[PDB]
Amino acid sequence: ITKDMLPGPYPKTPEERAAAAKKYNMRVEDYEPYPDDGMGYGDYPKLPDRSQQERDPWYDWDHPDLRLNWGEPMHWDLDMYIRNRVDTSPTPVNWNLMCKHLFGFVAFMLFMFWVGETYPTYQPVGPKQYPYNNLYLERGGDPNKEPEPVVHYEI
Amino acid sequence: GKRLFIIKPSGFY
């Protein structure tokens, strides 16, 4: 590799834009850079942020797992839009509709568990009754002190 | 019959 195929600074003149689009091996009309706010992207082409999962799978690819060709200017986040990672593919249900259904479902189930914790169900019984002063020596009571009498009666 | 050759890398080394 040599210098005139390497990235450079932001294209200002249209002939530098044409030289870059010839360098990045794409049409000049499709070639748009990242906007020169000073974030250091340089003259790299702003690809339209499509995940590689979205591509044609039956197409004869150079890189079949990446769904990518030789000499094609890759996406800037190509390490991010691999099929092991972030996807942007279309879904059968809308994005905001998914977020609304998920948030309503999760928050409503949380609220219903809070309602059921507010109002607990039980059995029509008294408490469970244990002998020997509510099992005082079994539950770790000291042998020198003597507790109050816990006496249960027949019924 | 009709035994097929399985291409694999060198397991010798």
């Binding site: 092991n84 990672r85 994005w95 169900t121 039980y122 059995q123 | -």
Partner: protein, 558 residues
């Protein structure tokens, strides 16, 4: 005494001996899968003797045999806890694994890496019986991370496939999010109790134990696929069928449930931990059973089945009934491993066909597979006096008759109905009706490996609940007095689920085409939860991992 501890260690050393055999190899093997299956059969026979002499007297012990480290007040020794939980889990795990490997000698016969497969499956078994026998938190963390890594290696078995690697990394991600809470629990016990040993944790018996139990509940969420950290267990069906049968149905995925059953003296004195376990388990057993109603891949449906059963296990821990939960683990292993084995027998017979919409007519084509699939489904739903009756129904017989979150009970009953719904859905689309698979029939099951491997778990799925529940001692008091509408709850709800799903299945023969409802789109796209968070949380990481982390700060400003 000298018999118990000796055969206890002989079981684990015997499981490790084929790993030394496969690592010290020069020849090509005289059927190394048969060698590992013979070894695990004999390890089952070996572990039967300590279980029988535990059922005789109740003999528990600890083998703290090798001193490993002493960090100034913390003596980390190699310590094996042989209690009721190990004595009931080790023969069940070895029996299930022995059936899975006799299954795998048929199913995985075309794989040229069959010795690596049986090696990895034995490594999983070794790490799992390290997990369930560990007496301190460190050896349990060894087995914990071991079953996580062997889960990675057995999901990504076809490592060329992108989806298998994706699902394996997904499972590692959710398990390490659970490991955040496990390490939180280890940190709390080391700082406040000066121990990782279970005995000093139980003897000190702390009262402000909300934070370590929240850590353990997050660990069981990461491990047993509870809600929030669940979708890796349906994603993990991309691995082979005996992987999903052994690991991700019956053996690995109960380890978060086993972690919470293991710490029962802390949960029985913390009502807040019981309430959080009850709410999370009811949420998971609702959600995964609801997602199972509208799926078409049979491995996905049985994975949602096992995750709903794990949510029910979390429910019955959350009502402070841990021994019923562990009886449900030992029960659930048999019929759920058998259901995955019969589904994979259908898959391998129908030439790698897993979608239930291209099955059917297999009642008389695969008769033994149909018999065992019906027996596994009926043990799952709670048919009277199969194995799944002897725990799950009792769970409902303690979920009704206790001081319980009422909505958790109602969602538990809705889950109990949904189990019957997806079970007869599997029997409808896969066994009943007329065929839908392609035209070149290669349907066959007449291998003694497959038939005997399903047969021994069939004997288990028929008799094992009766045998175990009449061989285990009482550790709680079984609540046996309730009104007749409350005693007949689980059976009636299960039969109502069968009736509702038979009406649903007989609405499919009608010549009508309806537009999809919002409930169908919700349950079919998995509550929209793997669709959003698997896109959003990586995105908000990785752009933040590139724009501000790499480019802005650590290449320009700093």
């Amino acid at each position: 005494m000298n018999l118990f501890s000796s055969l206890t260690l002989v079981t684990l050393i015997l499981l490790t001996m084929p790993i030394a055999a496969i690592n010290f190899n020069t020849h090509k093997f005289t059927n190394y899968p048969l060698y590992v299956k013979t070894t695990i059969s004999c390890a089952f026979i070996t572990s039967m003797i300590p279980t029988m002499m535990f059922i005789h007297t109740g003999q528990e012990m600890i083998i703290s045999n090798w001193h490993w480290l002493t960090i100034q007040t913390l003596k980390l020794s190699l310590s094996f806890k042989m209690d009721f939980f190990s004595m009931m889990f080790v023969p069940v795990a070895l029996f299930v694994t022995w059936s899975i490997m006799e299954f795998s000698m048929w199913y995985m016969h075309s794989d040229p890496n069959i010795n690596q497969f049986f090696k990895y499956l034995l490594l999983f078994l070794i790490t799992m019986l390290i997990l369930v026998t560990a007496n301190n938190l460190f050896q349990l963390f060894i087995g914990w991370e071991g079953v996580g890594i062997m889960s990675f290696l057995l999901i990504g078995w076809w490592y060329g496939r992108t989806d298998a690697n994706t699902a394996a990394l997904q499972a590692i991600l959710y398990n390490r999010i659970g490991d955040i809470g496990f390490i939180l629990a280890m940190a709390w016990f080391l700082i406040n109790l000066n121990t990782w040993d279970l005995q000093q944790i139980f003897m000190l018996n702390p009262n402000d134990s909300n934070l370590p139990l929240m850590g353990l509940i997050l660990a069981a969420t990461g491990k047993s696929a509870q809600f929030g950290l669940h979708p890796w267990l349906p994603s993990a069906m991309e691995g082979p069928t005996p992987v999903s049968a052994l690991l991700h149905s019956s053996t690995m995925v109960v380890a978060g449930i086993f972690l919470l059953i293991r710490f029962y003296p802390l949960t029985e004195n913390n009502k807040f931990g019981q309430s959080i376990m009850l709410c999370l388990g009811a949420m998971t057993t609702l959600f995964t059973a609801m997602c199972a109603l509208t799926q078409n891949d049979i491995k996905k449906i049985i994975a949602f089945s096992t995750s709903s059963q794990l949510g029910l296990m979390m429910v019955t821990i959350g009502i402070n009934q841990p021994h019923l939960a562990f009886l449900h683990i030992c029960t659930h292993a048999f019929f759920k491993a058998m259901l995955f084995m019969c589904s994979g027998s259908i898959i391998h017979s129908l030439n790698d066909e897993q979608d239930i919409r291209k099955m059917g007519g297999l009642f008389k084509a695969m008769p033994f597979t149909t018999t065992a699939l019906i027996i596994g489904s009926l043990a799952l739903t709670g048919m009277p006096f199969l194995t799944g009756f002897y725990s799950k129904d009792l769970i409902i017989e303690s979920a009704n008759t206790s001081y319980t979150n009422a909505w958790a009970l109602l969602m538990t009953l809705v889950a109990t109905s949904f189990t019957a719904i997806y079970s007869t859905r599997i029997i409808f689309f896969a066994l009943l009706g007329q065929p839908r698979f392609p035209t070149l029939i290669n349907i066959n099951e007449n291998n003694p490996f497959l038939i005997n491997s399903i047969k021994r778990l069939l004997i288990g799925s028929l008799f094992a609940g009766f045998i175990i529940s009449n061989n285990i001692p009482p550790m709680t008091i079984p609540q046996m007095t309730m009104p007749h509408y409350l005693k007949m709850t689980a059976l009636t709800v299960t039969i109502l689920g069968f009736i509702l799903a038979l009406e649903i299945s007989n609405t499919t023969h009608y010549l009508k085409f309806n537009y999809p409802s919002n409930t169908f789109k919700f349950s079919n796209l998995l509550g929209y939860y793997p669709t959003i968070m698997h896109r959003l949380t990586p995105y908000m990481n990785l752009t933040m991992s590139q724009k501000s982390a790499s480019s802005l700060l650590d290449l320009i400003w700093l």
